[PDB]
Amino acid sequence: SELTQDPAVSVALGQTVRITCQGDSLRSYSASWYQQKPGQAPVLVIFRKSNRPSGIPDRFSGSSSGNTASLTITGAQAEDEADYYCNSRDSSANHQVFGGGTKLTVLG
């Protein structure tokens, strides 16, 4: 399996941004989403399509439809500037596949 996402997007403070991932695995398997900030370990912000791990703000939401999955940030904050990666189970047992990441810039 393979996944594709746009390499970069911006959002203004307080606006909404949607980051989408596409690939065949997404018809079968739920997407998860990682946030990567400089000097930190990656953080799961969404898993199993739309569930938020403990402590993740509700301004992060996930959805899917068909061969696409999306991460939406509603009311973007300065701290949300990060690289975001979609992932899912891969066709190979015990493997996961990732998108190439989307760099989010938050302006204002």
Which position among 24, 44, 61, 81 is part of the footprint of a copy of itself (CB under 8 A)?
44
Query: Could you tell me which residues come within 8 angstroms of residue 46 by beta carbon, excluding any fewer than 6 positions away?
Result: 31, 32, 33, 52, 56, 60, 61, 62, 71
Q: How far apart are CA 84 and CA 90, in angstroms?
A: 18
* One character per residue 13-52, x = contact with Zn ion (rule: CB under 5 A): -----------x----------------------------
If one asks whether residue 7 binds Cl ion (CB under 5 A), the answer comes out as no
**91: helix, strand or coil:** coil
> Which among Cl ion, Zn ion, a copy of itself, none contacts residue 68 (Cβ within 5 to 8 A by kind)?
none
Binding interface with Na ion (CB under 5 A): 44, 53, 81
